[PDB]
Amino acid sequence: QGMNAIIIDDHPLAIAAIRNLLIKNDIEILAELTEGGSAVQRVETLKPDIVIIDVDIPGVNGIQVLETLRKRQYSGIIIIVSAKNDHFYGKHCADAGANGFVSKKEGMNNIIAAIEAAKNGYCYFPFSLNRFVGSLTSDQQKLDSLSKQEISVMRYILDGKDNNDIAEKMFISNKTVSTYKSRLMEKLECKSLMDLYTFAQRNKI
Amino acid sequence: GMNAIIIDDHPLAIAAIRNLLIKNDIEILAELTEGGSAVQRVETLKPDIVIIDVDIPGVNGIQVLETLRKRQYSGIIIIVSAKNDHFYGKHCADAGANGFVSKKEGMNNIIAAIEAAKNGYCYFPFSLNRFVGSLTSDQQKLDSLSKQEISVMRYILDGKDNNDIAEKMFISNKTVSTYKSRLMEKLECKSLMDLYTFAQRNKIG
Known part of the structure; x- marks a missing residue:
């Protein structure tokens, strides 16, 4: 609907399913990073609306890219994703300033639902009863x-x-x-x- | 195949929420406007969803939550408010809410909070x-x-x-x-x- 995003994940299949999901919903793809060592700089340069970071990117892990971006006053959307379940890891992304935490194990439809929730100013994190x-x-x-x-x-x-x-x-x-x-x-x-x-x-x- | 109980004394919101729940094939078991009978009547009907305005009279809407969670109610609970009350949302999240949606920002967030709960996530306002x-x-x-x-x-x-x-x-x-x-x-x-x-x-x- 006129938005764009950057993908930061080095799971080759996950990049495909995320790229397919963003494209299927008319979101442009400025970049696709597989290492974090330049993630903070790339995002600050291309200034994309959405940023999708796998928590386990090499070099500098996913939550570390999130903390630095927020320390450096980046206000855009950031949605952490994981290849594991990592339900306890969601609360830690909360206090660190993320907009989303979605496990790619239950599908890509929670990634898009996390996006539209952040569109509306809300956040999309796991719930631990x-x-x-x-x-x-x-x-x-x-x-x-x-x-x-x-x-x-x-x-x-x-x-x-x-x-x-x-x-x-x-x-x-x-x-x-x-x-x-x-x-x-x-x-x-x-x-x-x-x-x-x-x-x-x-x-x- | 879901059912819900609405707790709110804003007549414009009861109509607002009853309509939206019916628009998604969600049955409405009861429509309360009171806090004292809330904890009791929710557990009597045992609904999937309980939608509670934070401003209901008698027992504070946050207390209906805390008491329902303390009495080990495992269903979806989504707090709402007539204002924005973004700071109020975190108090709900730590109290055990599945979501906090400001009715000032439309009805589509209610149903989005429901879907986020159905998928095991939660839906709270993001505070940049x-x-x-x-x-x-x-x-x-x-x-x-x-x-x-x-x-x-x-x-x-x-x-x-x-x-x-x-x-x-x-x-x-x-x-x-x-x-x-x-x-x-x-x-x-x-x-x-x-x-x-x-x-x-x-x-x-």
């Missing part, structure tokens, strides 16, 4: 207590990555992987590896 | 002031007020003196004076002129 109704409300609060890096170290641990792999992916030292690991294990009140498993399996992460 | 600009501080003070201070505030913007509010909230003039000062302290407003400039600068009405 387990934060207000249930027994896993304490664990959900500890997940909201984590930091931007602690979340990443957690999601990497739940994928089976070692401290060297996490250091290379997050561009930090091995001492910093171990530091994040501890604070993370603390906030979640886990002490052993099995504690983190049953924590993730309880809250389904 | 919280993340970008020079009013990020003031927006946090608004996001820190209590559910009472909120109401005590909004009545002062409306233009109700200390006497009306005490009756409108069914409380003593002394307790009104306590809330007002806590409000005035949290908002860093010393005079009534301060609140006018605060409200106008942050666009509250």
Whole structure:
């Protein structure tokens, strides 16, 4: 309807399904980035209405591009997307200033619904009844207590990555992987590896 | 195959919302205009959707929510308001709402909030002031007020003196004076002129 967007995701199939969705609804495509290291600059230059960032872009992760853009006073629409479920990750994109968080696992129709919701000045984030109704409300609060890096170290641990792999992916030292690991294990009140498993399996992460 | 209960004493909105729900094959089980019988009658009929104006008399619309969530109601709850009340939305979201839609901005957001809830997401107003600009501080003070201070505030913007509010909230003039000062302290407003400039600068009405 006369709008445009930039896609920032390095999942080749996801780029296709998003490009097809934006085009099918008359939205122009200024760019398609697969790395964040220039995302902040590209978006500030081309000034697109919509920006779609996968949370797991390499170089600088998806939420980090969102935080920097907002710190640098970018006011346009930003809708974080994920290849995982990552329902707890939605609240963290909230307090960081995003307009949307949609998991590409349930389809592209939530991406377009997140766009029109941001068009109307609203936002389109996952809903966790387990934060207000249930027994896993304490664990959900500890997940909201984590930091931007602690979340990443957690999601990497739940994928089976070692401290060297996490250091290379997050561009930090091995001492910093171990530091994040501890604070993370603390906030979640886990002490052993099995504690983190049953924590993730309880809250389904 | 969905059904809903509408709770609102704005006759122009009851017609506004009943029509929109019928336009999407959503049955209307009950049409309340009262807070005291809300929590009881919702659980008696057990509807999928409950749409509640924040200004309903008796029990505050935010309390119908909190009590329904505390009594472990798992259905869709979508708060609405006659004004804009963007700051009010975050208080609903943290209280367990599936959405907060300002009726000032049309009916199509109600149904969009419903769809967002059906898909497991939520639909709340986006507040750019919280993340970008020079009013990020003031927006946090608004996001820190209590559910009472909120109401005590909004009545002062409306233009109700200390006497009306005490009756409108069914409380003593002394307790009104306590809330007002806590409000005035949290908002860093010393005079009534301060609140006018605060409200106008942050666009509250």
